[PDB]
Design a protein around this ligand. Structure first.
Ligand SMILES: CC(=O)N[C@@H]1[C@@H](O)[C@H](O)[C@@H](CO)O[C@H]1O
Ligand SMILES: CC(=O)N[C@@H]1[C@@H](O)[C@H](O)[C@@H](CO)O[C@H]1O
Ligand SMILES: CC(=O)N[C@@H]1[C@@H](O)[C@H](O)[C@@H](CO)O[C@H]1O
Ligand SMILES: CC(=O)N[C@@H]1[C@@H](O)[C@H](O)[C@@H](CO)O[C@H]1O
Ligand SMILES: CC(=O)N[C@@H]1[C@@H](O)[C@H](O)[C@@H](CO)O[C@H]1O
Ligand SMILES: CC(=O)N[C@@H]1[C@@H](O)[C@H](O)[C@@H](CO)O[C@H]1O
Ligand SMILES: *[C@@H]1O[C@H](CO)[C@@H](O)[C@H](O)[C@H]1NC(C)=O
Ligand SMILES: *[C@@H]1O[C@H](CO)[C@@H](O)[C@H](O)[C@H]1NC(C)=O
Ligand SMILES: *[C@@H]1O[C@H](CO)[C@@H](O)[C@H](O)[C@H]1NC(C)=O
Ligand SMILES: *[C@@H]1O[C@H](CO)[C@@H](O)[C@H](O)[C@H]1NC(C)=O
Ligand SMILES: *[C@@H]1O[C@H](CO)[C@@H](O)[C@H](O)[C@H]1NC(C)=O
Ligand SMILES: *[C@@H]1O[C@H](CO)[C@@H](O)[C@H](O)[C@H]1NC(C)=O
Ligand SMILES: *[C@@H]1O[C@H](CO)[C@@H](O)[C@H](O)[C@H]1NC(C)=O
Ligand SMILES: *[C@@H]1O[C@H](CO)[C@@H](O)[C@H](O)[C@H]1NC(C)=O
Lengths: 110, 196, 196, 196, 110, 110, 196, 110, 196, 196, 110, 110
């Protein structure tokens, strides 16, 4: 539902617009952005960034924002076009239940 | 359009899938292990299928659909994927779903989870999940999948259809381990023997 | 001449055909899909045949004929041709006809058409068509056909006859799409398996 | 001499033949089409056999014979020949005969003939013929034939005898068309399958 | 039952001695004489001779009599020996019923 | 039941004599003329001519008349002999029901 | 010695033969045509065997023997030879015999002979012969035959014995034609199929 | 039970000693003497000799006696040794019933 | 030790043999001719076996053994050897024995012998023999044989044991002819088919 | 965890072994000789299996296990090894055991042993052994084996697990002969056919 | 149970020690001695010796005693070692019943 | 459960710590120590040492202690590493029932 176009070697932004009807806080939620190959891009565990599973090519180029809830990916490439997912999970004491998901497909100059 | 046929067996199919990640061990498909039963007389569609080590009981409320067929498969890391084919869709109302998974082998027990899943992808439908036992680690449910349901496309005589409108797909998920999103993918060594 | 034999099965046949253009998909003949039932006790000949996706119920009033046999086939653009063979013709009076088509798969519904077809080709017979469902686009009915009813002329033991007088043939038609005259032609990939 | 055996099946046969010329179409012998029943309890021999399209019911009065077996065949120009084998002859008295032919296929109807046939070859016996329907053109009946009844002489185990005295033969005939004498002859493509 | 012998190339006579118990008339009866091959020899339809189906070799050589009820065949031949039948039919409005038949075998000088 | 003969390269007329017992109007009726190969010739949709499916060879050579209800075909050819149908349809809001049909076979100079 | 075994089936046999010369025609043996029944409960042995065209009913009075088995064969000039094998002999008293032959095929009738045969070979035993029908020309009965009873000597398992004392043999004869002594001989094309 | 011995080319006698308890007469009886091959030797039908079926080699050599009931066979031979039977039949109006039989084996000088 | 198993069938066997010299003829073994029945409910072992031409009924009094199996064979000079295998021996007391031999074929009769046999080999056991019929010439009985009971040693699954202590063997004998000691020997053309 | 499945048949197994050294002779495995029955309704798991010559009846008190399956084999010196597979272990409490061995063939008798075995390997559990008969020389019982239970690892579909914690294994032993420790070892000619 | 040893070519004695609890007499008894091949050695029928079946080699070498009930065999040989049986039968009018048996194995110098 | 380590060609000690809650005496108990191959090492039958089944290689090198309940093995070798069992049997009048068992694994310098 969200199509993003970027100029040749332009900057990439992935928002997913979490409504947050319950006025929840970042201390009780986890966020994942993943590509079409199932490789992780970033993780915000209960309010702090983690880099435990990001693939090497995805290291460093990511940046997370608090208020905007947008991930800023830099150094776009011709082969980086694909679909990204914004998976938000709630870390209850029993288990984690998915509470939001948003797809976004991005392509670069061809 | 108003009435469903209410026949014996159907050639026309549909789609809705789910995956259960269990901790105990399953090697491969057995080609005839599943056994399924279906009901609609209540005005609510219900399908109860007993498979490799667990029984799955799914109920769609205010559905206008009756589950025609199903298929089950086992993949890597002990994942059990169940596809469910219903008659046909007449309206777009985002039916609710109730799913109960009971461990009938090697991890029996009492109730361990009785919460409901919001599915805020569109935030219109809610699925109530009840788990009996400890033989579950991941639970994913995709209503109106947009992927390739046709396996060995296609079976000898049956016709298969699938939703192509992104607005109707629904995703429900519950995980107990750490970051088990995308518990597994369709096109794999999954054999997908017919469930009956 | 006065009496029809009223036997179990007949070696002698006749002709009368119809074609139904349905919107959903039918690939090819299944060789045993149809099932028919015949009745005459009322003095009105009635044949009800359930086939690929619909049930056809045809009644001839004041007939002196009992529907001996039938055959069904599927052609191009999802057309269903049904041939009906009766015992024998004793008089020329241009009987009436009542045809009911019920969608029993993939498009069930309530009544959508109850009008009558004049057939002013000779303007002596009237056919009342009742359609339940939305699984119909064309409906053509040829009474006393003059074309080649014998398919694979001829079946192993049966004998077949057909009217050769132009004044007896009748054509009834109803279309919901645009200009679907001549919904299909006999000699094609039509397999025409016997209906029973 | 006084008593007939009154057994189940007879190895001993005899002769009496007839031919019916019908208007509708018969192609060839079917090898198992006929079905016959026999009775004697009345002191009058009776045989009713249903074949290709007509049922023939023959009765001999004061006979001392019971119809052991029969054979039916079809020749050129749609002629149905029936041979009848009885137990054995004890006396020469020129028994009377009653024959009723009913059209049970393709020409049913009511009674069209109820007269009697004189047979003045010797002018001692009278055969009464009743025909229901319009499926008859020739009727010939030869009692005590002198020709070669043994067909494929002879069947595996049965023994066949035939009258050799000219004085006991009788010929009954009735024709509706023009000069149809000698409706057909025995030795032809006539297959003559056993009638039962 | 009736054996007829004639001298070489003599005249042949075929009677059949119709008893006629009912005292019927020729206007309502048809008479046929036929050989062992089913070829017709002569026909008397309701009082008038007819020559509609006689084989060419049998044409002319036949003659019919009223009172005698005997057919007089002339120009016998070596190959004409055989059996002849006297078939009498009664032409009722409904159908024709056979009312008399008589066989006769004829042979010529050997 | 209607045989039409025309002289070599003569003019052809196809009438079908719609009785019109209900006294209907051309505004609620359609008329089609088709040959033995199912190719269309002309169409009068609710009173206005349409040329949306006529084959190129059939274009222009056809002309429709109001009172006579006859289609006039010009430039006959040796290969134009065949059967033509006059199919009349009534355009109700629900569907169209065939209310008249007429066959006509035409041949040219041999 | 006092008692006979009174078993189901016996391996040990004996001998006593007869021959019936009938006028109607029988070609050859049928290998399974006969059917026999036996009784002793009365203190008088009785055997009733229905064969090719006649039923033979034999009774030995004050016997101490029960007919174990029998065989039937057809020879030249329409002769039917019946061999009868009894259990065993305990005493030499020249038992009487009663034989009744009934024509059950092709010559049935009432009683035609009721006299008794003296058998003055030793003049101690008398056989009472009753014939129903006209299907008989010769009747010979040899009790305690001294010839070679073992046919295809010997059957798979049965043991056969035969009298070797001339003083016990008995011959009864009755003929209606002219000088038909020695109606036929044993070793011929006679197949001698077991009778049961 | 009767053994008869004759010298080389001697005379042969076949008696069978009919008891005749009923005091019957030769007028109502028939007598046959037959060898082991079933060939007849003599026949006394109701008191009169008959020669209707005797084989040629047995013709003339036989002679029958009334009181003795013995048949005299002459011109013995080395190959004439065998068994002979005395069959007596009573010719009742219904049928003939055997009323006496006697076997006798004869051999010649070896 | 106290109890016998009282099972259905046994794999463990034992030994005790006998031989009957009969006058009538027996050719060879039939492989299925015997039929046996066993009983113990009375505290007395009983085995009744019907064989080629006689029925043998043996009873051991105060036994603690139940006859498990048996075998019968026919040798030279019309001898019938029967081996009986019992469960197992618990004590040494020299049981008594009662043997009844009934001629059921070819020599039936009443009782001809009712005496008892001393068996003074050790003079501690007595056997009572009752013979019905005349079909017996020799009777020998060896209890606890020391010869080679295993025939075709050994049967597919059964286990066989035999006494090796000379003090337990017993010999009972009765002869009616002259000097018939050692009526026959084991290792011969004897086939020894299992008895059941 | 609280509940056992209580199913028909289980794909999941476990371990517990024993060995019986009997004096009478057993040659080799029979592949289908055993027959076993199981029960749990009492809250005590009970398995009674009848095999080659003895019936073994085992009971676990306060078990939470039901004996899913068993296997039996025969080795050298007439040893009978029995393996038992239960559903699954839920807690570590060192259940007690009751074992009764009844000699049903070749050594039947009354009770000869009713004592209890301490098993001071950890000295927490006690097994009570009752032996009927004299067909036993060694009795060893290993609860929670650590050796390689999988025989022909592994059966077609079943999954097998085994304890790997040394603290849970228990050994019970009773011998009547001299120094019969380690009555035999698993990996040998032992065929180990499934027990049912 | 009775083992007898004899020196090389010594004399052999076979007793069987009939207890004779019934105090019977030799007039109603028969005694047989037989070897392992079933060949007889001697027979005492009702008190009189019989030599009806003794093998030639066994003839003469045997001698029977009354009081001792022992059979004396002379001229022993290396091949005469084997088992001998003392079978005693009682000759009742009905049949003979074996009333005593005794085995004895004898071997010579080797 | 007991791991024992010894220096190269050191001395080996195998205790099994029999609690002896019943305060039983050696006069009613038998003790066996056996290796992984089922070969015996020593036996104390009712208080007296026995050497009836010990393998030759284990002869003499063993020594048994009363108070310590420990077996002292000397002349260790590189190939003597393995598991040893302390099997104790109670010799009741009926049968022997195992009352204690202990495993001990020993390895040498490598
Ligand atoms: C708790 C919850 O989920 N409630 C909703 C309910 O408000 C809605 O009417 C229904 C229809 O989808 O679905 C469910
Ligand atoms: C509404 C209608 O169709 N009515 C006709 C009726 O007038 C006619 O008598 C009958 C016989 O064909 O058929 C129908
Ligand atoms: C009308 C008719 O046919 N009557 C005759 C009758 O006179 C005769 O007695 C009978 C015996 O054949 O046959 C019939
Ligand atoms: C009339 C006749 O034959 N009677 C005899 C009778 O005297 C005799 O007692 C019986 C026994 O053989 O046989 C019979
Ligand atoms: C007549 C006879 O034989 N009696 C004996 C009897 O004294 C003995 O007690 C029994 C047990 O073996 O055997 C038997
Ligand atoms: C005599 C005996 O063995 N008693 C014990 C008992 O004290 C214990 O509670 C139970 C549980 O394992 O096991 C058993
Ligand atoms: C399935 O679930 C429904 C409610 O969700 C329940 O009523 C039904 O009993 C269940 N089926 C079975 C077999 O337990
Ligand atoms: C029916 O046809 C469609 C396309 O024409 C094809 O995809 C499908 O596999 C066919 N199924 C059968 C049962 O023929
Ligand atoms: C019967 O004959 C007609 C023509 O003689 C032929 O067309 C038809 O196929 C035949 N049918 C059978 C069953 O023989
Ligand atoms: C019987 O024999 C006759 C002539 O001997 C022959 O014509 C007939 O076919 C035969 N029938 C059988 C069944 O053998
Ligand atoms: C056989 O004959 C006896 C008298 O001889 C008679 O009683 C019996 O009924 C006859 N058997 C049959 C079947 O009639
Ligand atoms: C039995 O043996 C005899 C001769 O020993 C033989 O003649 C007979 O055919 C045999 N019968 C069987 C059934 O073996
Ligand atoms: C059992 O083994 C013994 C010897 O070990 C052998 O003699 C016997 O034949 C065997 N029987 C079976 C059934 O295996
Ligand atoms: C299941 O898999 C395990 C290891 O993957 C294997 O050891 C076992 O034999 C397999 N069993 C079956 C029934 O496939």
């Amino acid at each position: 539902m969200l199509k993003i176009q970027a100029y040749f070697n332009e900057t990439a932004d992935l928002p997913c617009q979490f409504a947050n009807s319950q006025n929840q806080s970042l201390s009780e939620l986890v966020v994942f952005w993943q590509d079409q190959e199932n490789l992780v891009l970033n993780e915000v565990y209960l309010g702090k960034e983690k880099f435990d599973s990001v693939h090497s090519k995805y290291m460093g180029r990511t940046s997370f924002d608090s208020d905007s809830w947008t991930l800023r990916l830099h150094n776009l490439q011709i082969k980086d076009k694909g679909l990204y997912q914004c998976i938000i999970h709630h870390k209850k004491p029993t288990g984690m239940i998915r509470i939001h998901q948003m797809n976004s497909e991005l392509s670069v100059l061809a | 359009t108003i009435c469903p046929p209410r026949q014996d067996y159907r050639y026309w199919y549909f789609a809705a899938e789910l995956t259960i990640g269990v901790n105990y061990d399953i090697n491969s498909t057995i080609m005839g292990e599943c056994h399924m039963s279906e009901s609609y007389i209540d005005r609510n569609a219900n399908i109860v299928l007993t498979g490799y080590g667990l029984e799955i009981n799914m109920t769609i409320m205010d559905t206008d659909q009756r589950f025609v067929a199903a298929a089950e498969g086992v993949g890597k890391d002990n994942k059990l994927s169940v596809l469910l084919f219903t008659t046909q869709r007449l309206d777009k109302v985002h039916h609710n779903i109730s799913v109960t998974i009971t461990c009938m082998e090697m991890n029996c027990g009492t109730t361990k989870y009785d919460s409901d899943l919001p599915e805020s992808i569109h935030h219109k439908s809610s699925c109530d999940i009840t788990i009996n036992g400890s033989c579950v680690t991941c639970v994913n449910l995709e209503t109106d999948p947009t992927k390739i349901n046709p396996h060995y496309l296609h079976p000898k005589d049956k016709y298969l259809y699938r939703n192509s409108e992104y607005g109707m797909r629904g995703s429900y998920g519950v995980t107990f381990m750490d970051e088990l999103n995308q518990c597994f993918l369709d096109i794999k060594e999954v054999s997908y023997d017919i469930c009956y």
